[PDB]
Specification:
part of a larger assembly; 4 chains; A mainly alpha (148); B alpha+beta (766); C little secondary structure (39); A: elongated; B: alpha+beta; 4-stranded mixed beta sheet; 4-stranded antiparallel beta sheet; virus
């Protein structure tokens, strides 16, 4: 059963997308593998949460809102839903070799990191040096007045 | 934990070098120079772990004790030392006790006015607290000290079975003082011994011979009592006027020692020739603690001057100067062998005896007793409070620390370190910047906890050697006094195990009498030098106190250094207290465990009053900070994290397979020994009570959510460990023993080492 | 709040069962079996 | 993953802004280093909170409340986001620059100051990195000859 808190928002969201264009109705019917009739898929959404999710992946425009709210009230489907919906990210031909050149470089940062502290520190310390000189003067002067 | 390279001291140890101490920063000191052999058989040490309670109620103005509280103060609070403190004390004295108007007021405050009263019959006795309350009103003075020294004064003089009752009392705490005397610390030890010449006058029979005429003759007349008193306060004050200059007394008596030690003393200038009495000097000839002082003098002053007469006079100061340091000060004369006995040493060996790294540590036996007191006030806006001891909270805490004191003992860290320095090096020592030396000093780190000073400020001062002036003057003392306390503890140590030492003048271009620096003669079989000195001829001589340590054979600590707990239960219950407020900290602990079960998030927050099993939430209670315990466990967390930084650093270097599995076996082999310590901590009753309560709130939180699957799941391979640990890190945090950010990282070590998943077995200590 | 995060990501020492099976049964609920009629 | 609670806060915020003006593509690519397309940058937001926080601060019309919401909902990103976003305040001609603006900066110096040492030490360390590379080689060569 789909939880009402979700379903309240979910059902009209889908129905709106259907009324927007018919072209999606055929798509979701293919992905979910349900009868092409708009009344059919809407009967399926209510029945299973897993199904409800795949529909909201097919339409991301208006539907993204409910989907997240579905995800909240159902941590269960979260794992299963993540698997059923997947697309291999196209990899660039240059990428893996292009990464090979930075081997020398990153090992240099991590030598500097360990010395300073956490990476957060080094990002700070780097700015402190890059920082304008006057500021060093400013801080010295406040200490001249007594301020710490 | 301090970490330095013995080869180059100039860079990393510089403040701990001797060439800094005597103030030549350009170059190292040549062994070759005039040399005058001598023997150090004695030294001045403030006692380690001296904690006592001193009742100031009633009695008599015990002369010595009240001097020490001037000393204990001017040291504690900066203030530009004691000379101010003293002369102000005369002001105040010349403001009030020398002023008869205020005396008459008290008499009006106690009996009545303009009447004839009769002693002990129509005269009612009054508690000392009362007349004190009036001193606050009458005398608007800065320090509560000034009032107590006057209070017990008036208590003494007017009491031939008189106005004061025996019952009332106060008490005060004997705090840790800097152990080895700094130069200024001598100056004060003279002046503090000035003021008990003052006090022993107000306690004197000449002040007493007032009472001697009033004993059996009764006290009838209010003025003719008070006036008869007020004079006797000024007369005993006229006499006490005057005093020697500590600035001059010290400066001289060092210098006329300084001419004794130094190899270059032209024929005439030596003491034995122009001094009448050679006794006094003989005893202070051999004294070490003065030497390191004498170095402090010449560094700061830049010169030396006498301005005392050459014999007759300097033979009547010294025997009095022997007294000042003998008693008044917390500093007591000790045979030098037995002052540093508790220090110990262990080396990371390779072949011939040549150390890869050498570690010097202070041996402690973990001090576990925690008294949790609470404030109680009969009076408004008064520092002085009763403090209630609360048994059983002590016994919950001490029930927890009983297992803790077993596994955190400091003797077990150093066997852990050396084992690392062995696995890690894999290679000849000469390279990688020569040998290194690491040392750490809980007892020094302690001193910054009591002052709530970050110990990380000093240990960053040494390497650079120079202090930052941007901080306030009361901090610079606290830093520069502590930067010293290392340097003293080093040289008392090195001299203890290498009895043979020699003194030598320094050389510089322009206008300097110069300074004295020791040069040790140490013989040991190593065919290779560490630090840099010749190691030629089968013996080696070095200026630096550190290099003279490394050559030592391993040492076992002779005696545990044990901290007696401050004992409140005895004297606190019936009596007011001192500035308790900062010495202890408030008792509250607010922390929330979390876990996720059947893909459903659960949370149980827990507070401090429940964990003990106290129904009431009571914030009125506070915990006395056990800094010696926070010192050790802070150290352990420092070293432990320092390991895993090196191993994972030492692993990626090797680039060889047979070794990597020695290291990857070392990381894991710690992370279980760790994961067992924490869990064994969890079993402790404070441990247990956090466990039971952590689950119980989740079960009952769950049953409402409507599913009981818990009971099976929270006892599992993981989530029984997870909650077990988190209870083990809470108990450390709910005490002072660790900082919640430090535990958060200490977790992340168990994350990667994956020691957790590979155990799957719990031990219950019931 | 204390952070147990780091300690949370772990793996369990793996092992292989001698006779494989019983895998998808991890979570299921069979609803009860009725008794026979009585007379 | 990005918390779903803050997700519904950030996604309409960044999207509305992207559709409001195309010019905001200059911010995403500059710091975050996201791909040129508007669709891919959206996936980066969903992926990482740090990435998301740098999307929220950069587009400032509707964003601030949304950004502060992200902060509390995922508190680990606090130290990271506040640091990785820093803008130098230049200089005030008047003596009283104060903590008005420069507050964040004079704090920043002290951390850097604390680590290195006395305030002087840092300014020294500042310069050592500013020194021409050659000087290093010089110091090394005068070491090689056996001078120190």
């Amino acid at each position: 059963m789909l939880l009402p808190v979700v379903a309240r928002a979910a059902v009209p969201a889908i129905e709106s997308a259907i009324a927007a264009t018919p072209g999606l109705v055929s798509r979701i019917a293919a992905a979910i593998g349900s009868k092409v009739s708009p009344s059919a898929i809407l009967a399926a959404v209510k029945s299973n949460p897993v199904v409800a999710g795949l529909t909201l992946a097919q339409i991301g425009s208006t539907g993204y809102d409910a989907y997240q709210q579905l995800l909240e009230n159902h941590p269960e489907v979260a794992e299963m839903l993540k698997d059923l919906s997947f697309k291999a990210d196209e990899i660039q031909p240059d990428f893996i070799g292009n990464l090979g050149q930075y081997r020398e470089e990153l090992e240099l940062v991590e030598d500097a990191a360990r010395f300073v502290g956490g990476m957060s520190n080094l990002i700070r310390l780097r700015q402190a040096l890059e920082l304008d000189i006057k500021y060093y003067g400013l801080k010295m002067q406040l200490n001249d007045m007594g301020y710490r | 934990m301090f970490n330095l390279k013995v080869k180059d001291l100039n860079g990393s140890a510089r403040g701990l070098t001797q060439a800094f101490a005597i103030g030549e920063l350009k170059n190292q000191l040549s062994v070759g120079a005039l040399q005058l052999p001598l023997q150090f058989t004695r030294t001045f040490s403030a006692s380690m772990t001296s904690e006592l309670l001193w009742e100031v109620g009633k009695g008599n103005i015990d002369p010595v004790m009240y001097a020490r509280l001037f000393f204990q103060y001017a040291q504690a609070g900066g203030a530009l030392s004691v000379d101010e403190l003293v002369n102000q004390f005369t002001e105040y004295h010349q403001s009030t006790a020398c002023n008869p108007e205020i005396w008459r007021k008290l008499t009006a405050y106690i009996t009545g006015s303009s009447n004839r009263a009769i002693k002990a019959d129509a005269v009612g006795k009054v508690p000392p607290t009362a007349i004190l309350e009036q001193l606050r009103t009458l005398a608007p003075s800065e320090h509560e000290l000034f009032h107590h020294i006057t209070t017990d004064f008036v208590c003494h003089v007017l009491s031939p079975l008189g106005f004061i009752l025996p019952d009332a009392a106060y008490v005060y705490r004997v705090g840790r003082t800097a152990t080895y005397p700094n130069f200024y610390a001598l100056v004060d030890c003279v002046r503090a011994s000035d003021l008990r010449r003052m006090l022993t006058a107000l306690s004197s029979v000449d002040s007493k011979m007032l009472q001697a005429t009033f004993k059996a003759k009764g006290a009838l007349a209010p003025a003719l009592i008070s006036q008869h008193l007020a004079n006797a306060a000024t007369t005993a004050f006229e006499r006490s006027r005057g005093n020697f200059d500590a600035n001059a007394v010290v400066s001289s008596v060092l210098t006329i020692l300084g001419r004794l030690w130094s190899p270059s003393t032209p024929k005439e200038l030596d003491p034995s020739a122009r001094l009448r009495n050679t006794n006094g000097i003989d005893q202070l000839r051999s004294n070490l603690a003065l030497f390191i002082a004498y170095q402090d003098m010449v560094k700061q002053r830049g010169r030396a001057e006498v301005i005392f007469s050459d014999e007759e006079l300097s033979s009547t100061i010294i025997p009095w100067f022997i007294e000042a340091m003998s008693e008044v000060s917390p500093f007591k004369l000790r045979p030098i062998n037995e002052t540093t006995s508790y220090i110990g040493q262990t080396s990371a060996i390779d072949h011939m005896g040549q150390p890869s790294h050498v570690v010097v540590y202070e041996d402690w036996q973990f001090a576990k007793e925690i008294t949790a007191f609470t404030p109680v006030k009969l009076a408004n806006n008064s520092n002085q409070r009763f403090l209630d001891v609360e048994p059983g909270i002590s016994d919950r805490m001490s029930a927890t620390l009983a297992p803790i004191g077993n596994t955190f003992a400091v003797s077990a860290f150093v066997k852990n370190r050396t084992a690392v320095y062995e696995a890690v090096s894999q290679r000849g020592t000469v390279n990688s910047n020569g040998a290194e030396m690491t040392l750490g000093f809980p007892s020094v780190v302690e001193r910054d906890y009591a002052l709530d000073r970050d110990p990380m400020v000093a240990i960053a001062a040494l390497r650079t050697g120079i202090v930052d002036e941007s901080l306030e003057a009361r901090a610079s003392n606290d830093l520069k006094r502590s930067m010293f306390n290392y340097y003293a503890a080093v040289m008392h140590y090195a001299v203890a195990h290498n009895p043979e030492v020699v003194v030598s003048e320094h050389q510089g271009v322009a206008a300097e009498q110069g300074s004295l620096y020791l040069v040790w003669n140490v013989r040991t079989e190593l065919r290779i030098p560490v630090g840099y000195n010749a190691i030629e001829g089968g013996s080696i001589r070095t200026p630096e106190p550190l290099e003279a340590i490394a050559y030592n054979k391993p040492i076992q600590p002779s005696e545990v250094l044990q901290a007696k707990v401050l004992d409140l239960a005895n004297h606190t219950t019936s009596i007011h207290i001192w500035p308790w407020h900062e010495a202890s900290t408030e008792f509250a602990y607010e922390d929330a465990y979390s876990v996720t079960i059947r893909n459903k998030r659960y949370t149980a927050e827990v507070k401090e009053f429940e964990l003990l099993g106290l129904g009431q939430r009571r914030e009125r209670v506070r915990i006395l900070k056990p800094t010696v315990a926070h010192a050790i466990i802070q150290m352990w967390y420092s070293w432990f994290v320092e390991d895993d930084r090196t191993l994972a650093a030492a692993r990626r270097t090797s680039r060889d397979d047979a070794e990597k599995l020695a290291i990857d076996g070392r990381r894991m082999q710690n992370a279980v020994t760790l994961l067992r310590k924490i869990e064994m901590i969890g079993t402790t009753g404070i441990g247990a009570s956090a466990v039971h309560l952590a689950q119980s709130r989740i079960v009952d939180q769950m049953a409402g959510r409507g599913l009981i699957d818990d009971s099976s799941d929270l006892h599992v391979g993981i989530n029984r460990h997870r909650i077990r640990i988190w209870a083990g890190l809470a108990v450390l945090q709910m005490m002072g023993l660790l900082s919640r950010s430090e535990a958060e990282a200490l977790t992340k070590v168990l994350g990667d080492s994956n020691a957790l998943g590979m155990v799957v077995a719990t031990t219950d200590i019931d | 709040p204390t952070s147990m995060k780091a300690l949370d990501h772990t793996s369990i020492a793996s092992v292989a069962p001698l006779e494989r099976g019983s895998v998808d049964t991890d979570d299921r609920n069979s609803a009860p079996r009725r008794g026979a009629n009585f007379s």
